[PDB]
Design a protein around this ligand. Structure first.
Ligand code: HEM
Ligand SMILES: COc1cccnc1
Length: 292
């Protein structure tokens, strides 16, 4: 087991990171046409998850700390198809704030996106340090979408996530959409796909889903409303343990927000050792809270 100790970017404090947050949030507002006016919020959330979701608790390989998504092996992972859009978005931010590490920038992008899309506050800690190209994890550590509940459950044990954490994290599938050219799946999970809500769970329970083949010859569940669920999403209502939690979140927006916030921060921090005297986690104000 590798140790990665958080090391604060020299001399930086809350105000420095709130500036980076603000720069990301302002660009999110400005660049509003992307993906047929969905905007960049969803892809930034997905980027933060995929740079973290390479982690393996068994040896502390992968994970957000090293910022290794900047390297071509990872950038070109077929599981990461489409995330180049998020990376391109963050490039001018990194150029303006060259002092922030890549892992800190990619994870902060995800936090900023969730909060700006009216999601829960997600406490965030700085101190990821860029690591060399040879620390880049091999492709194939991110999950397949064509599998069942047992696959999902086992997969997430490698990220030290339990059933409640898994179900809560999957609620992010209310955001953005699947794109046939990226993943071989097509369509959004709901109507409000750039505002963070518990719609994923309501739609799983309330829509009439039909198992169909899309134009890439992959099965997905489709509703008459024009929504879709991946087999892995649908597995959350097939498995009785997942189903109970899906119902809980469909019936309690606040509980979903609180549980998502904890699991998402945990996901973004897996593999990182925080010194006892590290700064407390930062809670950034949204543009709206700042009157910006
Ligand atoms: C079983 C686990 C998961 C599977 C199999 C999976 C699979 C997928 C697939 C196939 C796409 C479509 C990519 C594209 O075509 O552009 C997608 C999109 C997305 N995923 Fe997941 N995902 C999983 C878990 C998660 C988690 C844990 C999060 C974050 C907390 C997340 C956040 C998102 C977001 C925000 C999008 C939309 C991206 C965009 O609109 O550009 N996913 N996911
Ligand atoms: C955003 O990715 C999605 C959308 C709908 C269902 N599953 C995943």
């Amino acid at each position: 087991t590798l140790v990665h100790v958080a090391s604060v970017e020299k001399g930086r404090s809350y105000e420095d990171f709130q500036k980076v947050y603000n720069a990301i949030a302002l660009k999110l507002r400005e660049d509003d046409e992307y993906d047929n006016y969905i905007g960049y919020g969803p892809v930034l959330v997905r980027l933060a998850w995929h740079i973290s979701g390479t982690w393996d608790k068994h040896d502390n390989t992968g994970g957000s700390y090293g910022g290794t998504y900047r390297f071509k092996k990872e950038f070109n992972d077929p599981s990461n198809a489409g995330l180049q859009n998020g990376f391109k978005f963050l490039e001018p931010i990194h150029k303006e704030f060259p002092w922030i590490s890549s892992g800190d920038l990619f994870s902060l992008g995800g936090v900023t996106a969730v909060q700006e899309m009216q999601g829960p506050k997600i406490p965030w800690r700085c101190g990821r340090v860029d690591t060399p190209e040879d620390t880049t994890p091999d492709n194939g550590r991110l999950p397949d979408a064509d599998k069942d509940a047992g696959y999902v459950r086992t997969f997430f044990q490698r990220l030290n996530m339990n059933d409640r954490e898994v179900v809560a994290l999957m609620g992010a599938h209310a955001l953005g959409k699947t794109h046939l050219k990226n993943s071989g799946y097509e369509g959004p999970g709901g109507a409000a796909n750039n505002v963070f809500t518990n719609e994923f769970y309501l739609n799983l329970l309330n829509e009439d889903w039909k198992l169909e083949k899309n134009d890439a010859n992959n099965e997905q569940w489709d509703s008459k409303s024009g929504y879709m669920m991946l087999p892995t999403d649908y597995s959350l209502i097939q498995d009785p343990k997942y189903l109970s939690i899906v119902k809980e979140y469909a019936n309690d927006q606040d509980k979903f927000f609180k549980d998502f916030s904890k699991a998402f921060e945990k996901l973004l921090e897996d593999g990182i050792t925080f010194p006892k005297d590290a700064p407390s986690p930062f809670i950034f104000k949204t543009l709206e809270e700042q009157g910006l």
